[PDB]
Structures are given as C-alpha cells and as structure tokens.
Amino acid sequence: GTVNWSVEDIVKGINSNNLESQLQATQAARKLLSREKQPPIDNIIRAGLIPKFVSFLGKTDCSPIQFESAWALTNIASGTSEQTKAVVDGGAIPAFISLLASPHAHISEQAVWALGNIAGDGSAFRDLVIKHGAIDPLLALLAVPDLSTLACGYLRNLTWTLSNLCRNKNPAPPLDAVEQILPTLVRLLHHNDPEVLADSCWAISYLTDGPNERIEMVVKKGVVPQLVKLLGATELPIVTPALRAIGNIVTGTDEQTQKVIDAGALAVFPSLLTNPKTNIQKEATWTMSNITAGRQDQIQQVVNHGLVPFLVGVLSKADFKTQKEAAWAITNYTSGGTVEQIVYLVHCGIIEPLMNLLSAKDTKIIQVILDAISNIFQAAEKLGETEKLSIMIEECGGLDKIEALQRHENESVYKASLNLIEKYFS
Amino acid sequence: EPSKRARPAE
Amino acid sequence: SKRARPA
C-alpha cells in the first residue's frame, strides 16, 4: 500500500491537500527513509519535503501524520550534518519540542528521538535545542516515582537524548543546563536496564571530560561509588563508559582522585588491566598512569592493591599503545614515589620489561623510559646501591640498548642516554 | 560511539 | 603531571 513508492509519487500525495492522501504519502516516505540500504535522504530533501513534514508535526487533529512525519524527519536528521541542518532549517526544533507533551506516547517518544539526533550533530545544534527550551519538557517525562513504570524503549530513548545534551565540547554544554539535567542523570544511573545504564555512563563520561570544575559538578552529586560498581559490570557496553568516566575524574585534583580510590575502584584493576578488550586495557592503564601521578599516599594504595605486578605485566606484554601508557604510569610513579616505593617497583621486576621497550621505534616512549630509569637511579643513589642497579640493567641487555641510544636522532634521547652512561656505567 | 540513530524498519 | 587521554 505504502510500500516502495517513488519520490515522485510521495510528492504528488503530499501536495494533494487531501489530508488522508498526505498521510499515506508521508507513511510511504517514512518507509523509504527507514530502509537499511541507502535510504534516499538526499532525494527526499531535494524534493522539498522537509517543510511539509514539519508542518505535519503540528497537525494535532491527525496524530497519525504527526507520527509518520516525526519518524521521517528523525531519519533525515540521523544523517550527515548537512542532512540534520536541513531538518533544523525547516523549523523542526520547536515543532518537536511541542510534541514532547503529546498525549500519544509513541509521538512523544519519536520527538525525543528526533531531538536526540539534532542535538547529537554537535555543540551548536545541541545548544540551539537547549535554547528552544527542550530540557524542561524532557525532564518532565522522567518525573515519575519509579522509572520502572515507563516503557523500556521510551526510557532508553529519553536517556540517550539526554546524553547527547551532555555530549561534545568547544564549548561544553551550558553550566546551567548541566546542573538542571544532573539530578535526573544520577537517578538513571541507578536504573536496572543495561542500555539505560550504558547511556547514563556515557553522559557522565562526557560531563567529566573537561576542566576540574566540570568534574566537581559531577563528583559532588555522589555518583563515584555507583560508577565504581558499574566498572565491575559484566556488560562491556557499561564497563566502557563507566571506565572512561572514572579515568576522566582522575585527571582532576588529588581530592577528586581520592574519591575514586575511596570508592574501591582499585580493586577492579586486576581485571581491567588484563581485560581481553584492548581498548579497556589501554584506558585502564592510562587511568593508572594518572593515579601514579598523584600523591605518595595514592601511589601507596596502588601498591597495597597489588597493582604494581599488573603494571609490570602490561609493560611486558600488551598492545603497544597500552605499553606506552604503562611506561607513563611507571615514570609518574618514580617521579612522585618515595625511595621505598621505587625500590619496590624494581623488586616487582620492572627493569627488564622497561629495558625491552627501549627498542621501540616510537621516540616519545624512549624519553619516558629513560626518565624513569633516571628516577630509579636517583633512588638507588640515596641507598648507595647504584652499582647493583647498573648490573641488573647490563645483565638484561639494557646497557647495550642504552649505549646504542647515544646514536639516536632526538637530542633529549641522546643527551639523556649519555648522562646515564657516564654517570652510572663508566 | 555513534551520536545519531536512525529508527529502522520493523 | 596528569595527562589527557591519547588521540
């Protein structure tokens, strides 16, 4: 009936001024636009249909055409920036906001979905959706005693749309919008649906990806313990954004970092640092490097949790980018740690895998590693045990690796090497 | 993570 | 000495 129409026929129906003809043609357009293989978004735009679809959003007496056109425009707005812009340019933003209050749940949901795609295009449309007043009516849809009474799909769409209002930078979302959304996000973060939890974590990860003040707005809401709980989830789609959020937080102050340690996050790292997903291991190791960049009592907690052997493990065998993060973790540890903590690192077997990575092609990791060796040596100096460390380094082939580094391109690389050699390996 | 989502045909 | 996430 409305299956496989030509764009020509859709236009003919939409221009008929018979509202039932328009309805059938709009549904035909929805069907074309919801096909998986190359929906003809550009042909529909070029046919001039967006203004008609937008006017149909306002037809309160014909809820079916509101739904069909909301679906058609949602799928156009799901495309390239230029496609989403065509939708915004036709006036869709206030028309979708008005539909948020529709008595028909399927129409309200579809308007939530369309605004999620518009806001998801980037900072400018995100902020334009906010200026048109989307937040108050979106939040009102979630103002129920128990989220479990909402249809599951509807709640997932609302959560996803809210996450796009939290997403993107340059600029980050307006501070007042973030403050307005946060109590609802905290509540969604405690909901029991895996997809709501994942998108709630994504939203929190965006809000903490920024300067310390943005992190504090989130940490002050008390969400860190729940994020640490979700870090432990079996679902990779939840662990991924929960870990990014935790990693973001520990880029903040020493005090923000302590909240993450206090909430028990370090106990999850034996698993994260051996996680079969490369991206999780790499993110977890980056996060460890920011914790070892912390205070001596925070380095002590990394020790107490048994995490130094795990760092030795990642240095010994991991994806190269993960080994690079491990190298930073070690350099930060040795830069901030006490001599006891540093000695401990050597006793855990850090020296050999550190030396092995000196054959890396990457120049930056060479610098980082040489920096750590220098720090370890300075610790050894204070103990009078410089010589023992020299032998350890020579025995595992490390001196050979360093001596050769005197013939490297980079200045800092050659300079740092010769300093090591002349000061410790006469 | 995709920031846009199309609603697919049922 | 905290570092941003790598590209």
Cβ-contact A375, A328 below 8 angstroms: no
Cβ-contact A298, A254 below 8 angstroms: yes
DSSP letter (8 states) at residue A358: G
With 0-12 / 13-18 / 19 or more C-beta atoms within 10 angstroms meaning exposed / middle / buried, residue A304 is exposed
Experimental method: X-ray
**How far apart (Å, rounded) are the C-alpha atoms in residues A325 and A284?**
9
Report domain extents, chain A.
1-426
Sequence letter at residue A230: L
Q: Which residue has the tokens 């491990």?
A: A326
Q: What is the resolution of this structure in A?
A: 1.9
Output the 3-class SS for A170-235.
CCCCCHHHHHHHHHHHHHHCCCCCHHHHHHHHHHHHHHCCCCHHHHHHHHCCCCHHHHHHHHCCCC
User: Cα Rg for chain B, rounded, in angstroms?
Assistant: 8
Q: Which residue has the tokens 């030795």?
A: A312
**How far apart (Å, rounded) are the C-alpha atoms in residues A47 and A253?**
54
Structure tokens given for A225: 């313990």
**How far apart (Å, rounded) are the C-alpha atoms in residues A230 and A190?**
10
Set of chain B residues whose Cβ sits within 8 Å of the Cβ of A31: 9
Cβ–Cβ contact A324 with B under 8 A: no
Between chains, do C2 and A328 touch, taking CB under 8 Å as contact?
A: no
**Angle (nearest 5°) at CA A419 between A368 and A293:** 30
Cβ–Cβ contact C7 with A under 8 A: no
**How far apart (Å, rounded) are the C-alpha atoms in residues A170 and A163?**
17
Q: SS3 of A352, please?
A: helix
**How far apart (Å, rounded) are the C-alpha atoms in residues A357 and A323?**
8
Write out the DSSP string of A95-149.
HHHHHTT-S-HHHHHHHHHHHHHHHTT-HHHHHHHHHTT-HHHHHHHT-SS-GGG
Cβ–Cβ contact A330 with C under 8 A: no
Cβ-contact A249, A243 below 8 angstroms: no
Q: Does domain A1-426 have CATH number 1.25.10.10?
A: yes
**How far apart (Å, rounded) are the C-alpha atoms in residues A159 and A164?**
9
Q: Which of B4, B7, B9 sits opposite A120 (nearest CB)?
A: B4
Substitution target in A212, A251, A331 with the highest count of C β-carbons within 10 Å is A251
User: Where chain A is broken, by preceding residue (C–N > 2.5 Å)?
Assistant: none
